[PDB]
Amino acid sequence: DKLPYKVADIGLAAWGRKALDIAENEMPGLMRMREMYSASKPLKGARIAGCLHMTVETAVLIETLVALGAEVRWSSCNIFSTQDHAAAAIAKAGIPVFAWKGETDEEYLWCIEQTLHFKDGPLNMILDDGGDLTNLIHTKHPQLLSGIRGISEETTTGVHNLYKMMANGILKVPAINVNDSVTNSKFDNLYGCRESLIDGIKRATDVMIAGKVAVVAGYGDVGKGCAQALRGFGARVIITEIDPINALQAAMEGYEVTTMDEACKEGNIFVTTTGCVDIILGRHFEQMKDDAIVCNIGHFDVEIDVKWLNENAVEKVNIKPQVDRYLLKNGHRIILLAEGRLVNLGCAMGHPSFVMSNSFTNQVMAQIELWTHPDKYPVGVHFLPKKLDEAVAEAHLGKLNVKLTKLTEKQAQYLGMPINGPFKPDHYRY
Amino acid sequence: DKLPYKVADIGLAAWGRKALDIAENEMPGLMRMREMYSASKPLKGARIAGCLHMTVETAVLIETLVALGAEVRWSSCNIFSTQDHAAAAIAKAGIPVFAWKGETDEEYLWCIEQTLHFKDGPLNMILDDGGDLTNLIHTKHPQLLSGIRGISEETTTGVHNLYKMMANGILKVPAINVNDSVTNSKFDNLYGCRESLIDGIKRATDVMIAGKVAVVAGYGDVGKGCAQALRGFGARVIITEIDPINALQAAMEGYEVTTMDEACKEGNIFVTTTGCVDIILGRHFEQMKDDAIVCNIGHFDVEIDVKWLNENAVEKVNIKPQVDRYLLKNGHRIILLAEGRLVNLGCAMGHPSFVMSNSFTNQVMAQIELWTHPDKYPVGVHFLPKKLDEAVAEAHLGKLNVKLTKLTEKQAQYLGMPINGPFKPDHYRY
Amino acid sequence: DKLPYKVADIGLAAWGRKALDIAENEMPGLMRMREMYSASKPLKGARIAGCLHMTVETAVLIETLVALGAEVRWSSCNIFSTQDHAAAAIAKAGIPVFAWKGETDEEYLWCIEQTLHFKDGPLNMILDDGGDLTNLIHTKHPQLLSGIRGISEETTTGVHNLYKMMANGILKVPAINVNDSVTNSKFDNLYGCRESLIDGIKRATDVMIAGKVAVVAGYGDVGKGCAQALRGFGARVIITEIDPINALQAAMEGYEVTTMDEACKEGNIFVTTTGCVDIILGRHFEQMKDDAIVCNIGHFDVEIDVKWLNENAVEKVNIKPQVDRYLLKNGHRIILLAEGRLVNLGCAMGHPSFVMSNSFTNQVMAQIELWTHPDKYPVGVHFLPKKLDEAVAEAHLGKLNVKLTKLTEKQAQYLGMPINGPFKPDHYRY
Amino acid sequence: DKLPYKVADIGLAAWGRKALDIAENEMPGLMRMREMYSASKPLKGARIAGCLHMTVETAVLIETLVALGAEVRWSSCNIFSTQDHAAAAIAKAGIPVFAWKGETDEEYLWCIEQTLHFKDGPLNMILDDGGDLTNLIHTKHPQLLSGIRGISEETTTGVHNLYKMMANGILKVPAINVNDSVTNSKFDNLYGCRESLIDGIKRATDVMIAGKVAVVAGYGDVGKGCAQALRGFGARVIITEIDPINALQAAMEGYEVTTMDEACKEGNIFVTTTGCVDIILGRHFEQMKDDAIVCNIGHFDVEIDVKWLNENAVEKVNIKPQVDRYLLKNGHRIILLAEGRLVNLGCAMGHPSFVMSNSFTNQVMAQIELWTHPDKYPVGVHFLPKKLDEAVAEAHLGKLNVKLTKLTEKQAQYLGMPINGPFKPDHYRY
């Protein structure tokens, strides 16, 4: 029970390494963190248990925490999101990794647990992207809690659960809600899904986007990026919403807002961008035009009533991996992607490296704070300082070559703000 | 010193009334406020002293506070923003108004003061769009303070000043920062300027936008709307910024971000969207291509070094009202609009009615809260509740015919939010 | 009957001249033609009878033909398109002009005739923008025909008529269909209306474009530009078409194509971009939403059933010049612009100078060809050579600063085309 | 030498059939052709020798000519474009096919030849996508010429060669230049590359498009679609052109036009869209930013100086199939895709089915004309009638659900055109 790592095939490393090379040039934030802190080794003594989809970009993250001098043990937060050659490299790198494609629920749980203990004791830091690493511990390894200094969550569902545990006096460790940074929120949510929604759809169906009517349920950040992605292609986007402010937003950009009920008749493509359930049900499926393409990029296979399909469907033919085509009792066909799960993760390579570098530099900064500024973070879920958000940004202005103008004493004075200090109030919405 | 009103020409009413008719159909918010509260007359006993550019939209605002039963005395917050026929109507309507186009600094001040006293005593409520109505009182009419229940500011410069006075124990009245509502911030800043930046430029120069290189300094809300407006026309927009998150924002939309110095060589059109000073100086002007069109939509004639022009310019020819053309010592001409002032306000009819309906419904709500819920607002600068913001929005979804989807018990539950209650956290940035 | 000119007020000149100055910097084409031919005076002995809306841009045109050494006599092709101060300048310039705003049908015809005879005999060249100058002659002044060397038409309706007369052996002069040049078709049709459709609507109604559903009948060039203009603002555009290729074109850009019948129910704004009649009829009007804004930019007040309005409308109130609002027997109002006429011409200053510079340089070239290469053009309607179209273009690449790459011997060869010669086949569609 | 077919693996069929099913729902044109002519069997007696990349869409094409009753023998016009499972199906279908992935030059030539003879004699009809099937015959099988009734080319390089042979009295068969139909040109060139440029780049590099500066050489149709594709993503596109009309075109859409020389310094991504050579050479490569991504979608590996790379490059590492990364003597890396060949064809699944359905229906129609109207087409290269172009379109308006408005006697008359007849002149450019 004392393995050094458990990946699909160690062989893949050489190639996995080829990728981490190309990818690193696209992740300025992490690479900067490496420069600025590789010497300081500000993470020494930290034993980080990371639970985040084991991909090429996470590899760059893992090697960045190590470079900042820290012990790390990783396990993918998803059973399918792993990239064996990515995990290959990290293993060959002499780093404990317990990740591989399509593992069983039992294997998953196993994987995570393998990151709990180091050879100098148990973990003292948690890096989560869903709270599985946090929940598991809190409820099965209470012992270790007193030994953990911090937790950095980056997911809505994880962050929330943190607020809950804290609200119910269960949280026994300070956490930093990384997800609510602007550079983390916008990228992981808006630019991220915008760049990879169609990729997922293309690789799956290779269908033409233009000229098609695409229904997008939810106008949040993710919904916004998808709506902008689909429209950039020539499709006519229709939006459904429950929040009147977001719905106004949509209408002001030219989209048509209506209910899924009315909408399910018009759509050609259907993307669900919510953390809500029962977005698309049988009464909708039976209205859809022949060969409608349904897929979800929200967060769980909980937005599409997949079950109904597998139930009220005549035949279910599998065109290919993660692309099935159900036959309705009315003659119409229904192309369902990723089996209802996240289409960009299930049909594409997830989000680009540059995007991840933004949400991941936030992650590296949370570790540093949490493990170097304990006094600053009492038990509760905290937010990263704004001056540090701007920091994640500025570190990316190089890659794309943008010349940032620098305020001047007079100006700064006039504005009443530090020439380098935070440039906006905390409630600023960008 | 006891006049009932002071407008340019009372005659204009008939026509001004023609406008308030057309205009009302474009301002659902306010018109809804009249429906929902015309009976309750929730503003009874309130004597509101309003200082907001006296336009056709403000007229609809004024008549809306009156319908909600309240005494009102108005004066434009600007010497040129007034629309004599709009002010005409309101006068004929038996409402004290002291506004007219281009008044003198002495007249302006005079105008404001005429709204201070009613025939039942002095004011008890303040509606400001710059803090001039607020400042003037606090420093020349301290008596009346104890008599004032609230203040509702809608301008950055006014809001700030409130925070200050409060910070220095000067503010002696609770205020509601109306400007930070989503439905007010976005419309008054983004959509507002987006709809009218080019209009002001067109009427002024009637120039062709497409094919031109337009330089926009500042990627805030206003900058965002102008950048989107100019690009929709075919211009190649370049942006300058001091904030690394806004600059990243820009770059992610395809714009080129650089410094004004480098930029002043390329630009054909120049729009300044900041609350900053010395954005465009002589060293820029002397770089600009022949016949460059310079104008500012920020907030004051403080962003362009007009002075330098009037100083280092050979001849200054006035093509027409609010449109001058300076001749440089190098052969290049410089078309300067609105004399450096707000171009949409000085070369156009400002923002549209529908937009105004949003930021103004917020205004009406602040009045009701502040004067119906004093207990709730101790002296300080407060924010309008979120459930109310959504309210301003929902009231506009009709005009544009958008079908809002309604959450369901199960859903609502799953999401952990009231089926009607606020759908988003307070830090939500939309 | 021998006046030297007939303009509204000669005084206006000083100001008209102010305009021609600013304007000339925006019309590189004509200004280049002036350089390249001011010396050659390639138009000597040519007596041009010009009939084109007498505006500031036409003035720059007029002075450009003269500079190329030619006698010119002008009359506007429209009774309202004229710009008195523009015509003023040209008169003070010692040039026969018979144009002024809103002249009577009898005055119009008069005006045209005054350009027929010079003090060395009658005209020998025709520059028409509607065929009124061409028709009039052919049927009332046959004598002069044998004396006229050429005709240059730039309008669909004028061009067609030429093809007809020619088809029926009536055409007695060679003509050059200038309208079908790329640089003239695209600018006068697409970029032209795109830049000024909304300006027209703003000045007229000052209404907010965003969030509205705009119906555009016809997806030709003009319709394409209007649809792109309206969408850049945030409106949701719907398109109607009779040609299946244009309709598919629309659908591939994300617009929704449907019939006016179904569309008339949704629309908030209505732009007709055809040369067809009966596009919007009573059965539509009685379907439109309250305060719908109807206007036409096609070519004649023949696309909207204005008549029906004036007939089946209860009351017709005139909000202001060129903006009326009919009241229907059902409670809905209808804002009708420019009285059914060209809205950009009737509510704005028409197209911008730079656009005009393109379609007018085409015009200047036709004159030169037709009058310097008679042998090349036998009686019939001809097209401007392609090498010359590219010429009109190359002449504008300077204003907007574009670095045109130059083919190289090896390349040119490989491509099989002249390094400077036409780069494209004649059926090329750009 | 009498094989019935030669494909990679016959087994693949079942799956290939799976595809042809899904695909057929996206190609309304061909599916319509099947309806309208399945009975007539208007192609009876025709023995078609098809040479077109053997993919899933060509499969649908092949089965469409057969359904119209015709013998067919196919061979891919490219050595790599073939799709073994697609070819699989067609073989299992009892159809002579000689296609498989990556065949040798000797094999290719062999494959083509296998379609020349049927069991009732040689071919009497040619369907070419490059003229390899035409050339080969004309120069090695002159006998058969007199036996061939028609040739339908769809490629620039093929069409041209036709005009040549004809110009040099070599062409001994009438041909129909299908490529110049609007529905074929626009789709195969504009919409086609627009939908699949980024897909090719994504699968290849999985790089993030937004925030990047993309250089596109050539503003033709393909260049136009690529430029619109990249911009919709958020990149800043810069264009290079030799044609002044296209360069103006670009500048009027907001792009920046300049020379490759100057541009090669700025670019992050480089797409070459010409039929020209030596677009990107060593002097450029040595200027490119680190990790620049170079790829070409023109028509041959002739636009990028690949050779130079393989010559002046230190090391060339192969990241993966069709994705190499050269290391320069200056430290910068250069990611070269598809080895310089067509990136959408070499890194993606080419163009979508719907697009192909357009350019392929054109193809089916040319066969019918050419083989049912010989008398109509004397030896020379002809264009498909316009009434038939609109036909290809109308046939697709269904899929996307667009309601085509139908002219009316009065209207039609007014317009002077047949209510169903062609709605536009031949020189119309859409």
Ligand SMILES: NC(=O)c1ccc[n+]([C@@H]2O[C@H](COP(=O)([O-])OP(=O)(O)OC[C@H]3O[C@@H](n4cnc5c(N)ncnc54)[C@H](O)[C@@H]3O)[C@@H](O)[C@H]2O)c1
């Ligand atoms: N797949 C990915 O790469 C990825 C990346 C980030 C986030 N996400 C997930 O996507 C989901 C949405 O994220 P977000 O940042 O846009 O959230 P968000 O909170 O900004 O927006 C969600 C939107 O859903 C709308 N909505 C809720 N219930 C609805 C219903 N029944 N019908 C229509 N609209 C409804 C809400 O009004 C809201 O505006 C989350 O579950 C999130 O974790 C996925």
Ligand SMILES: NC(=O)c1ccc[n+]([C@@H]2O[C@H](COP(=O)([O-])OP(=O)(O)OC[C@H]3O[C@@H](n4cnc5c(N)ncnc54)[C@H](O)[C@@H]3O)[C@@H](O)[C@H]2O)c1
């Ligand atoms: N004319 C109008 O109708 C109208 C309506 C609303 C607001 N405004 C005014 O416009 C201004 C901007 O408003 P906003 O809502 O976008 O503000 P904002 O705070 O959102 O953005 C201002 C932006 O300016 C940038 N900036 C500051 N100094 C700069 C400099 N020297 N060079 C380049 N960029 C610089 C900042 O980084 C910031 O992103 C304010 O003065 C505001 O009151 C005008």
Ligand SMILES: NC(=O)c1ccc[n+]([C@@H]2O[C@H](COP(=O)([O-])OP(=O)(O)OC[C@H]3O[C@@H](n4cnc5c(N)ncnc54)[C@H](O)[C@@H]3O)[C@@H](O)[C@H]2O)c1
């Ligand atoms: N106001 C201006 O500044 C200006 C400038 C140039 C041209 N025009 C005029 O605009 C008109 C259109 O010009 P264009 O260049 O786009 O012409 P166009 O020939 O390219 O397109 C006209 C379009 O109208 C469509 N159409 C015809 N009848 C229709 C109907 N009943 N319903 C729906 N669609 C219908 C046609 O299918 C066609 O695509 C002409 O009369 C032209 O002279 C006006």
Ligand SMILES: NC(=O)c1ccc[n+]([C@@H]2O[C@H](COP(=O)([O-])OP(=O)(O)OC[C@H]3O[C@@H](n4cnc5c(N)ncnc54)[C@H](O)[C@@H]3O)[C@@H](O)[C@H]2O)c1
């Ligand atoms: N890969 C595909 O799927 C696909 C599909 C259709 C066409 N094509 C090919 O793409 C190429 C271009 O097709 P198109 O329809 O756009 O052609 P096009 O003739 O419409 O445009 C080519 C453009 O290249 C420009 N150009 C030529 N030499 C240049 C140079 N040295 N520098 C800059 N610009 C230069 C020309 O001015 C012209 O506008 C052709 O070889 C064509 O066969 C590829």
Ligand SMILES: Nc1ncnc2c1ncn2[C@@H]1O[C@H](CO)[C@@H](O)[C@H]1O
């Ligand atoms: N390439 C990637 N590497 C790591 N995490 C990713 C990638 N693409 C998407 N994600 C993550 O997917 C999560 C949702 O499962 C998001 O929080 C997002 O950060």
Ligand SMILES: Nc1ncnc2c1ncn2[C@@H]1O[C@H](CO)[C@@H](O)[C@H]1O
């Ligand atoms: N038409 C209008 N009526 C009243 N205020 C306006 C109008 N257009 C713009 N404004 C105001 O101009 C202010 C800046 O001077 C903004 O806060 C905005 O709300």
Ligand SMILES: Nc1ncnc2c1ncn2[C@@H]1O[C@H](CO)[C@@H](O)[C@H]1O
């Ligand atoms: N400013 C202008 N000066 C001269 N002609 C114009 C102008 N704007 C539009 N036009 C002309 O309007 C004609 C249609 O009436 C078009 O052929 C176009 O060239």
Ligand SMILES: Nc1ncnc2c1ncn2[C@@H]1O[C@H](CO)[C@@H](O)[C@H]1O
């Ligand atoms: N999926 C496809 N099937 C067949 N031909 C294709 C496909 N995608 C692109 N092409 C062809 O690629 C050719 C250039 O090699 C184009 O003429 C185009 O029609």
